[PDB]
Symmetry: C2
């Protein structure tokens, strides 16, 4: 397309009525061709604009739904590993309590042991210190 | 506002005549002038608008493209963090499970000891239940 100055010069040439008909026709044809090309380039610009704007909306919905969706995909992992974390951390304290139980069993039984061993020990001492039944009781031990 | 190619042509055709009055010739030429100005202004607005659209296209093309990377790794920020804690819990589980099994072994062992000593005692108690001076001392435990 002709820059305003170039176009202006042509108009100025056309102002002269005694300009040769050859040159006059040349200039007017120049103007028609230029106007045609200008319209063409203009429409090209319009459609080439719509092409970009369509991409504007395109991405205004493309990664706008992708934001929400990726958020969903995040909280997915969160919830899952939360269920795993909990189902683990419950078993933990479950068998922890069970262990703490077996400890009490251990101490109870050790008490019983020390007790009966105490009785046996007292009997043993009595035997070491001193008739019929005794030899038999000592035959129990040896 | 810019004239349709047909109107424009209708002006140029008038300008072809060398016997056109200078007033009318000047007027036609100024018509072309003004129309051309308005058309190139419209064109410029169009170009600038195109840049305004393309700037937004090039905006979203990169903007949430970095968001892709962003959330791609910061998702794994949570994926990696609790794949370690889940490990910690699931390992605590079988740690105390192991200890607890050991406590089962201990339980049975101790119970065996109890049965041993208690048994010996019952034997002695048989001997005592059957039958003299030492035996009164041994009975004095009961």
């Amino acid at each position: 397309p002709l820059k305003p100055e170039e176009h202006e010069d042509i108009l100025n040439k056309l102002l002269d009525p005694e300009l040769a008909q050859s040159e006059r026709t040349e200039a007017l044809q120049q103007l028609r061709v230029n106007y045609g090309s200008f319209v063409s380039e203009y429409n090209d610009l319009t459609k080439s604009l719509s092409k970009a704007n369509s991409e504007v909306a395109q991405w205004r919905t493309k990664y706008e739904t992708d934001a929400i969706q990726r958020t969903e995909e995040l909280e997915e992992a969160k919830k899952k590993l939360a269920q795993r974390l909990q189902e683990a951390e419950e078993a933990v304290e479950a068998v922890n309590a069970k262990c703490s139980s077996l400890e009490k069993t251990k101490h109870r039984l050790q008490n019983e042991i020390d007790f009966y061993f105490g009785k046996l020990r007292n009997i043993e001492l009595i035997c070491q210190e001193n008739d019929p039944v005794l030899q038999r009781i000592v035959d129990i031990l040896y």
